[PDB]
Ligand binder design. Structure first.
Ligand SMILES: Cc1ccc(Cc2cc(O)[nH]n2)cc1Oc1ccccc1
Length: 134
């Protein structure tokens, strides 16, 4: 057993709050906000050795990142930002920082009861997205 066992699996979005406002704060344009905000992604998390993979599959976009904790990587986000990302585990929470154009946003993933809760923060704006096992 290891670091991220409780995250591994296939998860489906069941609720979202304030995501349009988060996307506005990030700089996502109108059309992308509308289509992205409609999506009901599945999130697939797996681990092989030290490499964690997070896939997001939806009608909007299919994305995949693979990474080692603490080791920076280049990421093209679903809204087409080219960012430098670093993901760490802090007290059982996966903390994903993205940097681009002198800006920064943090995405936290945590297990709470049977859910996987995703908190996205840009400056003062937070969005909460709740996923359940598929
Ligand atoms: C533009 C954008 C910003 C932030 C995140 C962070 C996040 C939220 C979540 O539920 N998983 N990851 C995702 C994203 O794009 C997508 C939106 C919907 C479906 C697929 C991709």
């Amino acid at each position: 057993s290891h670091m991220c066992d409780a995250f591994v699996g296939t998860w489906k979005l069941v609720s979202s709050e304030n995501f349009d406002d988060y996307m506005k704060e990030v700089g996502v344009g109108f059309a992308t906000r509308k289509v992205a905000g409609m999506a009901k992604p599945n999130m697939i998390i797996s681990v092989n050795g030290d490499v964690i993979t997070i896939k997001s599959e939806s009608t909007f976009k299919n994305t995949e990142i693979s990474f080692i904790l603490g080791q920076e990587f280049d990421e093209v986000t679903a809204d087409d930002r080219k960012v430098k990302s670093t993901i760490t585990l802090d007290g059982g929470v996966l903390v994903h920082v993205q940097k681009w154009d002198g800006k920064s946003t943090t995405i936290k993933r945590k297990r709470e009861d049977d859910k996987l809760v995703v908190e996205c923060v840009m400056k003062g704006v937070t969005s909460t997205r709740v996923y359940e096992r598929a």
